[PDB]
């Protein structure tokens, strides 16, 4: 993947996170489970929604009747009408096919980017209070209860609150 | 001392939708939407809410001239398009040329 | 048939907001563009990599 996260350093997906595109799995003393990150998911949904509606609604065709009728002495204009009909067919077919190919590629990259960034937002909060153990997981150098966990998902993790305890276990 | 852990991850599900990308064919995605309308109702419908004029076994020439085989056709006071059948050949039962026939057909289409 | 439509083809009516169709090139109405494609499926979710 363009950014290295999806099918990358985070090897597989989670059939257990059913409520969102990206999110978190935690295990601490009081329990364990998945929780979707609601904010980043809604943003991506909004982004992708805008994209689909864009591809659909920017085509605003007028009322037309395609068929044309020509007699046996009007073959040249009949073939002109066919050249027209065939030209549009080739154009629309090429562009529709390529457009989808390109946006599908861009859509997957976008998800890849969002996961990478989610990971980076967490790494940046924790700094050295946890150890990067790969596969997208962080192992805390201090006890992390549900309150602590929620601060991390919300982005209000208190690095100095746990910094002393962590440094002890890190040493 | 196995510390508490928090992992980032992403949704996967049971979906089998595949899509093509510029770099890779048949990529399975968790969801996708179709842009290509590829089904019809097998019916000829009202357009703008107005029924078409159906000519049965007559063609436009036969209908508009009043070919005796077209007498049984009902003709509304308006219609949104015209339908002929591929076997509709009750036309000019007395042979000859219908001058500017196709122009007339286009004029009468709706 | 006693049905309404906004786009009629020789082999059946089409009721759709989608921008493309492979039913028939000869249509009447406010219709989707005819294309030769057999599949124009746009991805919205993500690559599916279950366990």
């Amino acid at each position, epitope marked *: 993947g363009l950014f290295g996260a999806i099918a990358g350093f985070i090897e597989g997906g989670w059939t257990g996170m059913v409520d*969102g595109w990206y999110g978190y799995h935690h295990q601490n003393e009081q329990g364990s489970g998945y929780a979707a990150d609601l904010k980043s*998911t*809604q943003n991506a949904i909004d982004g*992708i929604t805008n994209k689909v*509606n864009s591809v*659909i609604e920017k085509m605003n065709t007028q009322f037309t009747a395609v068929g044309k009728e020509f007699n046996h002495l009007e073959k040249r204009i009949e073939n002109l009408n066919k050249k027209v009909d065939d030209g549009f067919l080739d154009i629309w077919t090429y562009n529709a096919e390529l457009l989808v190919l390109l946006e599908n590629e861009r859509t997957l990259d976008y998800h890849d980017s969002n996961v990478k960034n989610l990971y980076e937002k967490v790494r940046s909060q924790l700094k050295n209070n946890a150890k990067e153990i790969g596969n997208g997981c962080f192992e805390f150098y201090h006890k992390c209860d549900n309150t602590c966990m929620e601060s991390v998902k919300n982005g209000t993790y208190d690095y100095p609150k746990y910094s002393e305890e962590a440094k002890l276990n890190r040493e | 001392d196995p510390g508490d852990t928090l992992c980032i991850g992403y949704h996967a*599900n049971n979906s089998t939708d595949t899509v093509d990308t510029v770099l890779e064919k048949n990529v399975t995605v968790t*969801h996708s939407v179709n842009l290509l309308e590829d089904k019809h109702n097998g019916k000829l419908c009202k357009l703008r809410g107005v029924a078409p004029l159906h000519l049965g076994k007559c063609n436009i020439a036969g209908w508009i001239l009043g070919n005796p085989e077209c007498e049984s056709l009902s003709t509304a006071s308006s219609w949104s398009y015209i339908v002929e059948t591929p076997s509709s050949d009750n036309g000019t039962c007395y042979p000859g040329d219908f001058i500017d026939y196709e122009e007339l057909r286009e004029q009468l289409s709706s | 048939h006693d049905c309404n439509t906004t786009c009629q083809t020789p082999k059946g009516a089409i009721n*759709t907001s989608l921008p493309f169709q492979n039913i028939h090139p000869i249509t009447i109405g406010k219709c989707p563009k005819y294309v030769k494609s057999t599949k124009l499926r746009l991805a919205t*979710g993500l690559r599916n990599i279950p366990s």
Partner: antibody
Amino acid sequence: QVQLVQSGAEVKKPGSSVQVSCRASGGTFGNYAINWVRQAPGQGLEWMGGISPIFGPPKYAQKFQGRVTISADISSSTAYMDLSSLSSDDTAVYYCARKLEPPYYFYSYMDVWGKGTTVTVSS
Amino acid sequence: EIVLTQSPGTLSLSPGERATLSCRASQSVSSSYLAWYQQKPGQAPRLLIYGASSRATGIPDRFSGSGSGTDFTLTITRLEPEDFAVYYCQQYVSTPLTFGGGTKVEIKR
């Protein structure tokens, strides 16, 4: 402006199918979940399923597994509830309903309801 | 699963009086993913409470939710005449979404 507009009330014979529409009229369709809730005459409310067109595929309740399908037309801003597990005790009022303030892509609660489409299954 | 039974099926109270409806769950309930609706006959529901105690905008102050786990309560502190209707509780921690049976508050007389 944000309103859901249900299809007309309908009467279908037993065994056959019904399809109820629900046109949103506000904002860009697709980034919110639409739920389908059903209410038999003088009865509780049961949730059949719902869709968020873009987030993922429809999710259904087992009661209607194989008898119902929900789809959405992303351009026309419309969701469809198709039911053809048809009997006489499928006669009810059918509501489509959504959440209004985000995040609303998932099936949660519901601020905004249609007026309902009453559907009577009778030969 | 996670089915919610409401108690009592009907509640007879005269105006001005405290009404407290309850809603019990077959399984615990994720934080506070419980809404409360109000249906008057012939209409679709109005959302009263979400979260578990968060009042929906529009809803007058007399309505207040509370509770957690498998026990929730909806309290109406002064029944006005408008307030007489059926009240359904709904959960949304997990699909399938399930409602309550509903409690009908009626006018005691």
